[PDB]
Design a protein around this motif. Structure first.
Motif, short mmCIF file in Angstrom:
data_model
loop_
_atom_site.label_atom_id
_atom_site.label_comp_id
_atom_site.label_asym_id
_atom_site.label_seq_id
_atom_site.Cartn_x
_atom_site.Cartn_y
_atom_site.Cartn_z
N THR A 69 50.26 34.17 49.83
CA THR A 69 50.81 33.09 49.02
C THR A 69 51.53 33.61 47.78
OG1 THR A 69 49.09 31.57 49.75
CG2 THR A 69 50.20 31.07 47.65
N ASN A 70 50.95 34.60 47.10
CA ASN A 70 51.35 34.97 45.75
C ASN A 70 52.03 36.32 45.63
OD1 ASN A 70 48.40 33.39 45.31
ND2 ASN A 70 50.15 32.66 44.15
N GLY A 71 51.94 37.17 46.64
CA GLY A 71 52.43 38.52 46.53
C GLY A 71 51.47 39.40 45.76
N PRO A 72 51.81 40.68 45.65
CA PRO A 72 50.91 41.64 45.02
C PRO A 72 50.68 41.38 43.53
CG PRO A 72 52.61 42.76 46.31
CD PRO A 72 53.02 41.33 46.19
N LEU A 73 49.53 41.84 43.06
CA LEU A 73 49.27 41.88 41.62
C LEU A 73 50.13 42.97 40.98
CD1 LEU A 73 45.37 41.56 41.40
CD2 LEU A 73 47.07 39.76 41.28
N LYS A 74 50.14 42.97 39.65
CA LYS A 74 50.69 44.06 38.84
C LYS A 74 49.59 45.07 38.53
CE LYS A 74 53.70 40.75 36.44
NZ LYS A 74 53.97 40.04 35.18
N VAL A 75 49.96 46.35 38.44
CA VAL A 75 49.04 47.32 37.85
C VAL A 75 48.79 46.92 36.41
CG1 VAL A 75 48.63 49.74 37.32
CG2 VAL A 75 49.89 49.11 39.39
N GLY A 76 47.51 46.80 36.04
CA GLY A 76 47.10 46.25 34.77
C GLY A 76 46.76 44.78 34.83
N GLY A 77 47.05 44.11 35.95
CA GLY A 77 46.82 42.69 36.09
C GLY A 77 45.54 42.35 36.83
N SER A 78 45.35 41.05 37.06
CA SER A 78 44.11 40.56 37.65
C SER A 78 44.35 39.20 38.30
CB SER A 78 43.01 40.44 36.60
OG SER A 78 43.25 39.38 35.69
N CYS A 79 43.38 38.80 39.12
CA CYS A 79 43.28 37.42 39.57
C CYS A 79 41.81 37.07 39.73
CB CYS A 79 44.05 37.18 40.87
SG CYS A 79 43.35 38.03 42.30
N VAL A 80 41.49 35.79 39.59
CA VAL A 80 40.15 35.27 39.80
C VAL A 80 40.05 34.68 41.20
CG1 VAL A 80 38.39 33.68 38.99
CG2 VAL A 80 39.91 34.78 37.33
N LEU A 81 39.11 35.18 41.99
CA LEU A 81 38.83 34.63 43.31
C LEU A 81 37.33 34.36 43.40
CD1 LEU A 81 41.26 36.78 45.51
CD2 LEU A 81 41.48 34.36 44.92
N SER A 82 36.89 33.93 44.58
CA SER A 82 35.47 33.64 44.75
C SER A 82 34.62 34.90 44.62
CB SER A 82 35.24 33.05 46.14
OG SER A 82 33.87 32.79 46.34
N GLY A 83 33.40 34.71 44.13
CA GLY A 83 32.41 35.77 44.14
C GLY A 83 31.56 35.80 45.40
N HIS A 84 31.78 34.86 46.32
CA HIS A 84 31.10 34.84 47.62
C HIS A 84 29.60 34.84 47.38
CE1 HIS A 84 34.94 35.04 49.68
NE2 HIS A 84 35.29 35.83 48.68
N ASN A 85 28.83 35.67 48.07
CA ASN A 85 27.39 35.73 47.94
C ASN A 85 26.94 36.62 46.78
OD1 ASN A 85 28.64 37.70 49.69
ND2 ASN A 85 26.59 38.50 50.14
N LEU A 86 27.86 37.18 46.01
CA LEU A 86 27.54 38.17 44.98
C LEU A 86 27.56 37.62 43.56
CD1 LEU A 86 29.74 41.11 46.31
CD2 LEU A 86 27.32 40.68 46.79
N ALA A 87 28.38 36.61 43.29
CA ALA A 87 28.62 36.11 41.94
C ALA A 87 29.32 34.77 42.09
CB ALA A 87 29.52 37.07 41.17
N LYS A 88 29.42 34.02 40.99
CA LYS A 88 30.23 32.81 41.05
C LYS A 88 31.69 33.16 41.32
CE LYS A 88 30.83 28.33 38.86
NZ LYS A 88 32.28 28.14 38.59
N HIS A 89 32.25 34.07 40.53
CA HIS A 89 33.64 34.48 40.62
C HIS A 89 33.72 35.99 40.73
CE1 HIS A 89 34.70 30.50 39.12
NE2 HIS A 89 33.87 30.69 38.10
N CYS A 90 34.78 36.46 41.36
CA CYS A 90 35.17 37.86 41.30
C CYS A 90 36.50 37.97 40.57
CB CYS A 90 35.27 38.50 42.69
SG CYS A 90 35.79 40.24 42.62
#
Ligand SMILES: OC[C@H](Cc1ccoc1)Nc1ncnc2[nH]ccc12
Ligand SMILES: [Cl-]
Length: 167
Positions: A69-90
């Motif tokens: 949908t969004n294409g690659p991140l930038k080096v130095g960048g980030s995105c918030v996705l699900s944390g699945h079974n490990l955390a609320k967010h990753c």
């Protein structure tokens, strides 16, 4: 008060422990776990490979849809996705990968992403297979992150070296 246990306190806001980040996240179930991502969100090795394996590949499936949908991140960048079974967010954060020839100055930009979250469980960015000096990564973390960060260090000799060399 939070449920993080057994950490050494380095500064007002940075804490450090010899720990497997996968096992830590499963125990604490923190609000945010940081992944040492690449721009393609291809979670093959290092922390990213380990976190993805612990999600039974659900992290990779979600990530592939994000990139489509969004294409690659930038080096130095980030995105918030699900944390699945490990955390609320990753929070997937891309530190520069020295073994690709990327600019180490981008490490500060990468750590700035942590300031958008009040509390995080994280690895040292650009350490391990990303090829940077972990002592340097810890210094940049302490001098950049102002929110509360709990650092899991996988390697025991490195953890002891990081503590004993910390200024
Ligand atoms: O800086 C990130 C370090 C790099 C490193 C240096 C020596 O070994 C690994 N990697 C990890 N840190 C914490 N938890 C982890 N789980 C799986 C990998 C992993
Ligand atoms: Cl690694």
């Amino acid at each position: 008060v939070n449920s993080f246990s057994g950490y050494l306190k380095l500064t007002d806001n940075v804490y450090i422990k010899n720990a497997d980040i996968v096992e830590e996240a499963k125990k604490v179930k923190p609000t945010v776990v940081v992944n040492a991502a690449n721009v393609y969100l291809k979670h093959g090795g290092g922390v990213a490979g380990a976190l993805n394996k612990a999600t039974n590949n659900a992290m990779q499936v979600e990530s592939d849809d994000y990139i489509a949908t969004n294409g690659p991140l930038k080096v130095g960048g980030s995105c918030v996705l699900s944390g699945h079974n490990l955390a609320k967010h990753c929070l997937h954060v891309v530190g520069p990968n020295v073994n690709k020839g990327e600019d180490i100055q981008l490490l500060k930009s990468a750590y700035e992403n942590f300031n958008q979250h009040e509390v995080l469980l994280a690895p040292l960015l650009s350490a391990g297979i990303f090829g940077a000096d972990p002592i340097h990564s810890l210094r940049v973390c302490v001098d950049t992150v102002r929110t509360n960060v709990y650092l899991a260090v996988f390697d025991k000799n490195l953890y002891d070296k990081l503590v004993s060399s910390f200024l």
